[PDB]
Each structure stands twice: as structure tokens, then as C-alpha cells.
């Protein structure tokens, strides 16, 4: 199976290979296409370790040699014996760079192979879980030259022991329902504070209060820690052209990291295990401030800038949408905190994709999360064909663990 | 079986049955979807259960399902294909079809005008130069001095392939383009190839930048015929900017009238290859589309330097900027000139309601995420967090190859 993708502004085609190697299922069928849909034993596991193993010594041109046929064997033993198996160090970090590297969703991965692994494998508490997240922190924040990271927590057992971090992003913001009924700060994390509240939390009940982190060890009940503050890097917002822009009182968090999701690798599962890149600028301008159910902020900022707010034709909301955007830009261009424009982002990714075609036989992607939120189509992803599928090691969404545990 | 999606902005869910009726295969699998990729003579047995399907549907939505004037016509139908090996169509039954492939299309935002449709039934069509006055009326109606209708022109069905009748052009009004020999274009360099074989036919171009070239059409299979839709025919807006006085200086016009002529329409297992149709733009098909892409007319870098904006590093945001200005600029055009445009605002928000109501009184509106999102402020607009479920109902309109790719030249 050869399937051709053609890029409608070059009319360049390239040829996808590596879908063959495809293993998860992607919720379409051949009646009906799902791709705009967010969410759609000892005897299962020795297949998905030898798949793995088989690719890792692949990688480093040692396949079917005697160091790869042991370790096979080696694995095959420790399974029969303990149901279970332990990755080695260098697996490991091939493996979260391939979770990475897969992951079809993320328009960054140019960069997928410059990824520090904290492995904390080790790790036993909660108490423990907090040292190494703080580390993460500092190490990937590195006053505001930002590096990639991941840090790595024990596998599942029999899933009865998890480790989870309980927050969806290691740095976020407090949301608080009002007896006025509006909402106080980032609504996306209204019940998760209140589960913080309710376990302890003194609540600062401000707009951009940084949540405490609830950390599970060892399916234990999840227990409450502060990020030092001096940890959490903030940039406040202001425009270079307009003056008013600073007395909206907008701030952001220069972090992003991913801390509710699944790394699996060779059939092994990583519930926790935090993740951090650097932002694109739209992510905070156009997601998180401009969303409808988010900070909502595109009123207040035509309003300052008297556009004429009576007719959708006017375009008012895309004028003040620019100007958000611009805003978020200069601010962490200004304080140096490393960020990335929407342009600038998809077009290493096209380059990017390239590259993957041609040393890979693909590069899987999935259109509606890699476009950008705005200004789509001047970009040079929207015009390029893409073809979605999963490929492992990889990264999976995982419900809320309020709604799975067991106090 | 249900199907449920969700809006992510406003957390309302909705619940799909309507798939059940689907027939046609979308090129995805369970290992791999394929729903950004753009292009993913019948016999007797297969013609028959088309048919019945088709008319099974059509007495369902007129409450006569199973009467004796259903079951009479099913009879008559199949006593037709059987003798004749195909059928016609009732004009009543063809307005329904048409009116059911634009309901169905599922790239179009703008299907909650699906109903209002006027059907122009030109079966009786027989040569170029009657196909050319049928196109000329259609373009006289529907542009209705700037009060814009939609419209839909039907050329005879398919018999053997081999004497298709099909309109060459893309859409029936479009700008001409010309590749120098410096390998500059002038014009719309989407147009290149289809003016080169205008030319070859023997147009005489008057090479400028907004030349609206010439019909090529072709009746039962023979070779296509040119024609020059009368000029006072085609409305065109002068665009100009309600801020930035050097606006119209950049010379600037486009056509009112979008009319897609290049599509199949396929009701009850019969096909029509010629079945030009029309209504009015949403603006960011010109100002974004038409304007903006980099194969296209390619203008952000011009209306950028006479911003001037700084454009040393993208991080400005300075595309964005007159992108946004570029677009005030044909929505202000139109309006003023009193000619139906919709912003994508507008449109979108009309396209969730039209959404909304087919799941409660049809079980569903099937609809490609790709296409009905806008091509810029996509999030802002409430198509962007809805979840949509794609897949393919009949009567449909269907891509076709260029006619220059698979035309017999007779001479
Ligand atoms: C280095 C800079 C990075 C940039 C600029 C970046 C960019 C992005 C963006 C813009 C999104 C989608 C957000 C949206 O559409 O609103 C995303 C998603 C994602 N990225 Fe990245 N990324 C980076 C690093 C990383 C790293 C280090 C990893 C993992 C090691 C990663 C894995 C993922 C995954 C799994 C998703 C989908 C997340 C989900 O399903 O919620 N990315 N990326
Ligand atoms: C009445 C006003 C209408 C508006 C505002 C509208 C809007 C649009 C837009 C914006 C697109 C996609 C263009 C793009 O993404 O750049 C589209 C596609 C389409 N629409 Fe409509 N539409 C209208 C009427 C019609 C009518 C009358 C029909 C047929 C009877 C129709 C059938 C289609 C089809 C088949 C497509 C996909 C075209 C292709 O595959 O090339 N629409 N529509
Ligand atoms: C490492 C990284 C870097 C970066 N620049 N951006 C990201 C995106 C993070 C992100 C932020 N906000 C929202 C989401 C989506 C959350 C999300 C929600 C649901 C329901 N399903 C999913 N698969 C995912 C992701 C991650
Ligand atoms: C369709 C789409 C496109 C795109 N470029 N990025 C994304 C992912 C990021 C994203 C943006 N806006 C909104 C969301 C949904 C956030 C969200 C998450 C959860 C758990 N519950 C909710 N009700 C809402 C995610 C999605
Ligand atoms: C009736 C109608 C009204 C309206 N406002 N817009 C449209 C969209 C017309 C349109 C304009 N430019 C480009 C296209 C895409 C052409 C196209 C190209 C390819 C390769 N495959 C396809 N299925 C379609 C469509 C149609
Ligand atoms: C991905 C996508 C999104 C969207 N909102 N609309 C469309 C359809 C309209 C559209 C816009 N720009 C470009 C094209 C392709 C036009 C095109 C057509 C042909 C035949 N050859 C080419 N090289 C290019 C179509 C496509
Ligand atoms: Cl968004
Ligand atoms: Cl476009
Ligand atoms: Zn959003
Ligand atoms: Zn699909
Ligand atoms: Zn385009």
C-alpha cells in the first residue's frame, strides 16, 4: 500500500509508507470519517515488546544480531516469570522520543529528538513525585531559554498502584464559580479546584492563581504541593502600539506541560508522566484568552480599541484577535521567554515532513489539531494533505483519575 | 446504532442516525483516515436498487410511502430500465434530487438555504449553442441586478459515456491567466491550463489581470464549442477599503456571481454531468481564497508594504494584519455595492442553527470539518469546537476529472 499526499499550493506529492507499520485503531470506517472527533496478560504483551525491541535494534543497525536476539530472550523470560518487564535506560529514551516523534497532533516535532529524559523510575511517594517535578520545572524553564523535557514515572502494575499526576498541566490557573455567576479565573479548571479546595488548599480566589499539584503515588490517595513560586515563570501581557493593553491585568505562565497523558512503550504503560515544549503564540492568544469558555477576552479588547461592535461584517472580533496575538508575542519576545509564531511553527513543520518522508516513509499527522486556530490557510500546512494514523510508542489521552479513584 | 458528537465550547451533545443511510465509502479505515486528502455507463442490476432507494425516499418526504402512486411508479421505472435500460425522471422528482444533493454536500456551510434552490430543468438540451443560452439565463437569474438567487441549470443524463455533455470551465464566470515567458503569471494562475485551451480554440485574449474567459461546452459528446457570456451579464464589485483610501488603487475587482460548473450530480443511480450551479460568496472565499493563497492572485506582501507594516520578522503578525484589512475591504465592496455577501461569521453561525435543526428533524447533517471551517479566525467561530461526523448520502454532487484529460477529439 503506497498512498500518495499532494500539497495543493506546490502541488509537490509525496509517497507514505511507514502507515503499514500502523497499529492502533482510528474510530473512522469506511462509512464514516471520525477525524473531528476529540475522543474517538502475559500473552497480549510479549507481541508488543518484541515490536518494539525489534524496532529499537533496528534503529541502532544491530537487528537480528546476537545482542538483540538476548534481549529478546532476556524479556521473554522476565515476562513468563513476572508478568511484567523493565525497560533499559537507553530503551527508555528511545521511547519517549518515539512517543514524541508519533504523537499526530503536535506541529513542534522538529525538534522530537532534542528531548531531555528525567527517568524517575525510582520514585516511591508522593513527597518523591513533588522533588522531581520541581527539578523538571527549573531544568525545562532555565530562565526563560526553555528546553524540552520529560520526566518518567513507575509503570502500571496491576493498575491498582498507579502513579498519576491528578492536574492536566503541571503550571495552570485556578477557576471559581461566583455568587455573581460568572466565573473567577480560568474557567477549563473549575472542578479540579474545587477537589483542591476540598482536599486542603487555601485558595487565594484571584484570576490567575497557579494551582497546587495532587500527586498520586502507587494508587495511593493523591496528596497536595505547592510549586515553589519562584519556579513558575510568568510573562505579563502588554502591546507594543497600544498603551491601555497592560491595564487588562493579562498575565500567562511561559511553561506548557502536559501532565494527564499516557506514554506507552513496548507494551509497558506510563500513567504518569509530564511533558513540556515551549509555546506557540496562539495557543495563549487565540485558545486560551479567545475561546468562549476560556478567559473570553475578545469584548473587553475591541471595546478598548472602538471598533464598530454593532455588525459581524465589520470583522471587529478578527481585528482584535490580531492585536491579542501581536500582544502575546512582543511580551515574551520582550522579557526573553522562548515562544514560537504560528508561522514560523508550521513551516518547520513542513520541513519537518519532509524530512520524515524521505528518511521514514511518513510522518503521520492529524490536519484539524496541526492548522493553527487563525489565519489558517497562510500557513503552509493547511494546503498539504495529510494522513492520520498511530503509531507506537505513544501517547495517550487517559480520563480525569477523580472519576476513576477510589478514596 | 447512535453516533453522539459534542460541542466543545458549549458542551451540547447531539446524537447521529441518520450515517445509517450511508452507502458510499469514504477512503478512511480502521488504520487510517484520510479526511484531509481532497480527492480520497452503469448495467441494469445495479441501476434498479438505486432507483427504488431514490423513490422510496422521495415518497417518504411527500407522505406516500407504499401508496398505489409510489407502487406505480416503481413499476414503471422498472419496467423502463428493463426495456430501455435506463429511466427519466419526473420534474417533480428532479427539483427533490437537486435540491437533496446541495442538503447532503457535506462541505458546503451554507446549506441552511438548501430548500430555496431554483431548479432550471434543461433535459430538452441538445447542442453547444442551446446550452450556451440556458447558461446565459441561469447567469441573468441568479445574479437578479445584485439581489442574488440561488440556481441550478440540468443538462441531459449520462447514456453511454459516450456523449457526456459538460461544461470544460471550472465555475461559468472565472479570470483568465497567462504564464510569461519569464515565468511570471498574469491573471489567476489557477486558470493557466483551461485559458490555453481557450486560446488553441481560438479565443482572442486581451491578456489584462481580470479577463472573464470564454465558455467551452460540449453537448453529447462531441468537441467543445466557445462562447463570450454577453459582458453586461457578469457583475463585477470594484474593491475598495472604507478606511484606507489607496485600497482601489491596487486595482482590485471580482465577480459576484460563484457558480460551480465542473461536478457530477447523481440522483437515483442516473448522472448528470453537467449541472452548473450557483449562489453568493461568504467573503473569505475571495479575500483569503481568491486573494491570499500563494498559487492564487498572492497579494499580502503589496497590501502589507502599503500598511506599512513591519515585515522583517513574521512574529508581527503583519500577514495577519492585512489579511484581516484585506477582507473588511470585500465585504465592504459588496455591501456597498449592494451585492449578496456573507461574512464567515454570519455563515457559520447560520450553519450550526441549519446543523442543529437536521439532527432533531433528519438525525443528522453530515459535514467535512476541513472544508466548513474558515480559512482564518477558525476558533472564534462556533464551527471550530463542534465535532462533526462525515459521510456520504445520495442524490450527491461528486468531483469529475477535467474534460481535456478524458475527451475523444473527434476533429
Ligand atoms: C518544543 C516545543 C513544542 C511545541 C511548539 C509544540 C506544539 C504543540 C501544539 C501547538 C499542540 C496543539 C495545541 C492546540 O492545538 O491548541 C501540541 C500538541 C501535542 N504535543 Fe506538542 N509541542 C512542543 C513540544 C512537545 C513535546 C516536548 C511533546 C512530548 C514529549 C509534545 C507532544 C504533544 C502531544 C502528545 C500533543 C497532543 C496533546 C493532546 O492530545 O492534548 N509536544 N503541540
Ligand atoms: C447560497 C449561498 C452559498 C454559500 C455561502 C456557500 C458556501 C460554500 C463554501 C464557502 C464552500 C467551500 C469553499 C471553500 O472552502 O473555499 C462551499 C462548497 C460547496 N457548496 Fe456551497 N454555498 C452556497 C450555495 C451552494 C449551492 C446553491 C450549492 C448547490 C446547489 C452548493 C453546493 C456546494 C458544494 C457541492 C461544495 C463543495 C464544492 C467542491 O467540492 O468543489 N452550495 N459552499
Ligand atoms: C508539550 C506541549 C507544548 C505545547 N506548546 N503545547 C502543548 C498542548 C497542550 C494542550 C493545552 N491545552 C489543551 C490541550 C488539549 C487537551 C485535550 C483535551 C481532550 C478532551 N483530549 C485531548 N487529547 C487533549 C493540550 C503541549
Ligand atoms: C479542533 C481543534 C483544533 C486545534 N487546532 N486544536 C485543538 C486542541 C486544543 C483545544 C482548543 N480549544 C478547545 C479545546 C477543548 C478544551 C476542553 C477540554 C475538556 C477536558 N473539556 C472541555 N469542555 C473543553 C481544545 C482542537
Ligand atoms: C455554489 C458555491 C457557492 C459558494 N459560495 N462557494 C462555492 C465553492 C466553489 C469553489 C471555489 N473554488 C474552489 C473550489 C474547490 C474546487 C475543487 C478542487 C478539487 C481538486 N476537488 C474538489 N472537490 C473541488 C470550490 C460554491
Ligand atoms: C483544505 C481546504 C479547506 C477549506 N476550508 N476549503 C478547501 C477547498 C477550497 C480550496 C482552497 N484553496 C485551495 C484549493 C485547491 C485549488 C486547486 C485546484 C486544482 C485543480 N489544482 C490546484 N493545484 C489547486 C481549494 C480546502
Ligand atoms: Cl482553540
Ligand atoms: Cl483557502
Ligand atoms: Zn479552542
Ligand atoms: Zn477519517
Ligand atoms: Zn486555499
Known amino acids: 500500500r503506497f498512498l500518495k499526499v499532494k500539497n495543493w499550493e506546490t502541488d509537490v506529492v509525496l509517497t507514505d509508507t511507514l502507515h503499514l507499520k500502523s497499529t492502533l485503531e482510528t474510530g473512522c470506517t469506511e462509512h464514516i470519517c471520525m477525524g473531528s472527533i476529540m475522543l474517538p496478560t502475559k500473552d497480549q504483551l510479549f507481541p508488543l515488546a518484541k515490536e518494539f525491541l525489534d524496532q529499537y535494534y533496528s534503529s541502532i543497525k544491530r537487528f537480528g544480531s546476537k545482542a538483540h536476539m538476548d534481549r529478546l530472550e532476556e524479556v521473554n523470560k522476565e515476562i513468563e516469570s513476572t508478568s511484567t518487564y523493565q525497560l533499559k535506560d537507553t530503551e527508555l529514551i528511545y521511547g519517549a522520543k518515539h512517543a514524541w516523534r508519533n504523537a499526530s497532533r503536535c506541529v513542534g516535532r522538529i525538534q522530537w529528538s532534542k528531548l531531555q529524559v528525567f527517568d524517575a523510575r525510582d520514585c516511591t511517594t508522593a513527597h518523591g513525585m513533588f522533588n522531581y517535578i520541581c527539578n523538571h520545572v527549573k531544568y525545562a524553564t532555565n530562565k526563560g531559554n526553555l528546553r524540552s523535557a520529560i520526566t518518567i514515572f513507575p509503570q502500571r502494575t496491576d493498575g491498582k498502584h498507579d502513579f498519576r499526576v491528578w492536574n492536566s498541566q503541571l503550571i495552570r490557573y485556578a477557576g471559581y464559580k461566583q455568587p455573581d455567576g460568572s466565573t473567577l479565573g480560568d474557567p477549563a479548571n473549575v472542578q479540579f479546584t474545587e477537589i483542591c479546595i476540598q482536599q486542603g488548599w487555601k485558595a487565594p480566589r484571584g484570576r490567575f492563581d497557579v494551582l497546587p499539584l495532587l500527586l498520586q503515588a502507587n494508587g495511593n490517595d493523591p496528596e497536595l504541593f505547592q510549586i515553589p513560586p519562584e519556579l513558575v515563570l510568568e510573562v505579563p501581557i502588554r502591546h507594543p502600539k497600544f498603551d491601555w493593553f497592560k491595564d487588562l491585568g493579562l498575565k500567562w505562565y511561559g511553561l506548557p506541560a502536559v501532565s494527564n497523558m499516557l506514554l506507552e ?122 494522513l492520520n494514523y498511530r503509531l507506537t510508542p505513544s501517547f495517550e489521552y487517559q480520563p480525569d483519575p477523580w472519576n476513576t479513584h477510589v478514596w
Open 265 to 386: 512503550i513496548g507494551g509497558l504503560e506510563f500513567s504518569a508522566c509530564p511533558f513540556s515544549g515551549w509555546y506557540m503564540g496562539t495557543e495563549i492568544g487565540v485558545r486560551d484568552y479567545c475561546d468562549n469558555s476560556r478567559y473570553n477576552i475578545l469584548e473587553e479588547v475591541a471595546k478598548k480599541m472602538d471598533l464598530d461592535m454593532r455588525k459581524t461584517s465589520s470583522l471587529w472580533k478578527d481585528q482584535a484577535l490580531v492585536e491579542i496575538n501581536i500582544a502575546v508575542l512582543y511580551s515574551f519576545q520582550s522579557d526573553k521567554v522562548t515562544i514560537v509564531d504560528h508561522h514560523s511553527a508550521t513551516e518547520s513543520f513542513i520541513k519537518h515532513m519532509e524530512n520524515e518522508y524521505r528518511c521514514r516513509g511518513g510522518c503521520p499527522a492529524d490536519w484539524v489539531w496541526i492548522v493553527p486556530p487563525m489565519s489558517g490557510s497562510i500557513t503552509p500546512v493547511f494546503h498539504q494533505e495529510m
